[PDB]
Design a protein around this ligand. Structure first.
Ligand code: MG
Ligand code: MG
Lengths: 88, 88
């Protein structure tokens, strides 16, 4: 199942361009990041990015979930900022 | 930090009306659900629903995150349905 951490990690793959560079940004190891994705791909039933691809390419399902991330993550951020607004 | 499971659980509190009824829906115990929320409230820095309240009342921060859930969860659902569409 898709979690918020998977959506941010998908953004790191696009923003950093490789599994190793994104792992360095997310303070994780490269294998642990690869293990998290294949673990997610197994439960979802489809792959998120092209295996062995260099440069790394997303699958159509990965592009869909990346666009999902670009939409949900700013909304969660704005919601938590409103929760911490000096009011209510 | 807000997770997808926290957003669905917030919807269960509104849809079921109590911590005990929502726990039965989510296949969790009542204390484990209460432990998950106070755990989340501790890290966020604010409370999500009024303590001891009967009937259960959300705080203003809980209403904000509930409206967040009503917006994000359908988008995640539509994204996964598109991923499983017989195409791509
Ligand atoms: Mg993988
Ligand atoms: Mg609590």
């Amino acid at each position: 199942m898709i979690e918020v951490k998977h959506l941010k990690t998908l953004q790191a793959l696009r923003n950093c361009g490789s599994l190793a560079a994104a792992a360095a940004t997310l303070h994780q190891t490269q294998s642990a990041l690869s293990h998290q994705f294949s673990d997610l791909e197994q439960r979802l039933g489809f792959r998120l990015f092209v295996r062995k691809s260099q440069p790394l390419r997303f699958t159509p399902q990965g592009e869909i979930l990346l666009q999902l991330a670009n939409q949900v993550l700013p909304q969660i951020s704005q919601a938590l900022q409103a929760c911490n607004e000096p009011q209510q």
